[PDB]
Design a protein around this ligand. Structure first.
Ligand code: ZNH
Length: 126
């Protein structure tokens, strides 16, 4: 990497809200994720698995930004702003689905949430 630092694949994960073990969202988020900074700031791009299932996501209490929605490969991405990236933050997400799962009409349309977990530097400022 050169002529464009402040960016790379940082470690990160998520967990079931109200618990401490990922139980659902963990099956739709690949890893690791790509974090990025800008002298006194930083964000992170998350990979979205199957858009037809996940309608969007939010971290720290704000919506996400469409950075790269690939419909051909069914993979979207979104950038999130958060204080550094070494712990976890209360994020949220929306979902929307409507189809028969193997002969079973499955309806889904609400605003669920999940615990985010970033893993990278911490201070690095003397
Ligand atoms: C598509 C297919 C699908 C299905 C069928 C489902 C289903 C479901 C169910 C049934 C539930 C409930 C459970 C109990 O009752 O306990 C849930 C939840 C759920 N979910 Zn989900 N999902 C899904 C997807 C999904 C996704 C994609 C996501 C994102 C990533 C999610 C996220 C979720 C969450 C977060 C939750 C939690 C909510 C509660 O619990 O409240 N999810 N989910």
């Amino acid at each position: 990497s050169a002529n464009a630092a402040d960016s790379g694949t940082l470690n990160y994960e998520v967990y079931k809200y109200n618990t401490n073990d990922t139980s659902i969202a963990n099956d739709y988020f690949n890893k690791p994720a790509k974090y990025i900074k800008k002298n006194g700031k930083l964000y992170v791009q998350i990979t979205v698995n199957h858009s037809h299932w996940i309608t969007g996501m939010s971290i720290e209490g704000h919506k996400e930004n469409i950075i790269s929605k690939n419909t051909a490969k069914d993979e979207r991405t979104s950038e999130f702003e958060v204080s550094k990236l070494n712990g976890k933050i209360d994020g949220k997400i929306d979902v929307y689905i409507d189809e028969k799962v193997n002969g079973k009409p499955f309806k889904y349309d609400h605003h669920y949430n999940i615990t985010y977990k970033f893993n990278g530097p911490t201070d690095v400022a003397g």
